[PDB]
Amino acid sequence: QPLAKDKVALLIGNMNYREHPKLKAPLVDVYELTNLLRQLDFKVVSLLDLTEYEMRNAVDEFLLLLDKGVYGLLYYAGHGYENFGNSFMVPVDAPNPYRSENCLCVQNILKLMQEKETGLNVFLLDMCRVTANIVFGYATCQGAEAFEIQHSGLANGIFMKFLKDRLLEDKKITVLLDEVAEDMGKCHLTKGKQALEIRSSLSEKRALTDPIQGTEYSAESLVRNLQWAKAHELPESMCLKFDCGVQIQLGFAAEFSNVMIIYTSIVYKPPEIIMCDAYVTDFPLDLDIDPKDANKGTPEETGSYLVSKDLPKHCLYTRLSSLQKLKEHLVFTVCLSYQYSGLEDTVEDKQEVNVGKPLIAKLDM
Ligand SMILES: CC(C)(N)CC(=O)N[C@@H]1COc2ccccc2N(Cc2ccc(-c3ccccc3-c3nnn[nH]3)cc2)C1=O
């Protein structure tokens, strides 16, 4: 009987704090929740390491998708702050000490969610310390150095560990979150360290597994919804042919909506060319790359650990992790060094590549 007009989700994970301890769990947690929600037919946007401005802009764009009957899920994992009975999401650029004005107020987002006529609105916070059918989950796990454990790096946070084991169930969201709360209560490590409070104003039997009804996008909501659904689409693979005859294959992969991996490999070397090597350079300055971190022999050397299963071997890898900062088309240079058989000189050739505005860059931020 219950139907969703559409299913949208925004997941934010903050790890690389400029003035606060770096977190490791949001990377794996946001990555695993993204896949789980996509299996439930949600159109997901996942963003890693956002500033105060970037966080406010992403939340505003997500709030704009919440039309009548739509199911929306917002997930935040990172540093949290509590002050005067209010809770705040701490962006990566927050100065030390914490100031409320530099953070996103959770209660204020809840207030904006209450004004929507959503079929379901799930807001989950995983922090380190008229009806809209709002189900609010508030997990607090202040620590990492407070447990004594030498963690895996690719290890899951406490909330996500139990959440991922139950999210795919066809059960009312409030009943499902109550089971996660019970699971955490059974875990002895959690005692006095983790906490979870569920607040709910859900007056009807709604679940994340509910089917999508007559979607029927309105006039002004059309572009917004198509753009959100397409921020998961990668640029297609390309084969670049150089003047000397050498062919380079350029491939693309994604960890998050703002993290893309570019890989290159020499697919054809004419017999006249004795030796050649290709590399990528001159990326837009807003991305803050540094050649000492690009063109690596393995994806792990670039800071990429999550999509090694989908990455072809024997390539050179580059990780672009600040795609949300891209204001224009992604234009870069593919450089080729080559030598003719019987010649001593090394020749240099280069061509520019324009892959448009990929993933999160499609959104009008
Ligand atoms: C908001 C958040 C992150 N969902 C809250 C949360 O769940 N916090 C818990 C607290 O510590 C745990 C206690 C029990 C089980 C799992 C965890 N993990 C997982 C984890 C912890 C540390 C590291 C790590 C590994 C190498 C180097 C540095 C760190 C590091 N140092 N500090 N943070 N990461 C990796 C994963 C948590 O992150």
Curated annotation (Swiss-Prot):
Extent of motif Nuclear export signal: 33-40
Region (Caspase-like) residue spans: 12-210
Organ and tissue specificity: Highly expressed in peripheral blood mononuclear cells. Detected at lower levels in bone marrow, thymus and lymph node, and at very low levels in colon and lung.
Domain of life: Eukaryota
Effect after changing residue 301 to A: Abolishes binding to TRAF6
Active site: 79, 128
The family this protein is said to belong to: Belongs to the peptidase C14B family.
Linked pathology: Immunodeficiency 12: A primary immunodeficiency characterized by onset in infancy of recurrent bacterial and candidal infections resulting in bronchiectasis and growth delay. Manifestations include mastoiditis, aphthous ulcers, cheilitis, gingivitis, esophagitis, gastritis, duodenitis, and meningitis. Levels of absolute lymphocytes and serum immunoglobulins are normal, but specific antibody titers are low despite immunization, and T-cells show impaired proliferative responses to mitogens. A chromosomal aberration involving MALT1 is recurrent in low-grade mucosa-associated lymphoid tissue (MALT lymphoma). Translocation t(11;18)(q21;q21) with BIRC2. This translocation is found in approximately 50% of cytogenetically abnormal low-grade MALT lymphoma.
Binding partners and assembly: Homooligomer; forms oligomers which bind to TRAF6. Forms a complex with CARD14 and MALT1; resulting in the formation of a CBM (CARD14-BCL10-MALT1) complex. Forms a complex with CARD11 and MALT1; resulting in the formation of a CBM (CARD11-BCL10-MALT1) complex. Forms a complex with CARD9 and MALT1; resulting in the formation of a CBM (CARD9-BCL10-MALT1) complex.
Name of the protein in question: Mucosa-associated lymphoid tissue lymphoma translocation protein 1
Gene that encodes the chain: MALT1
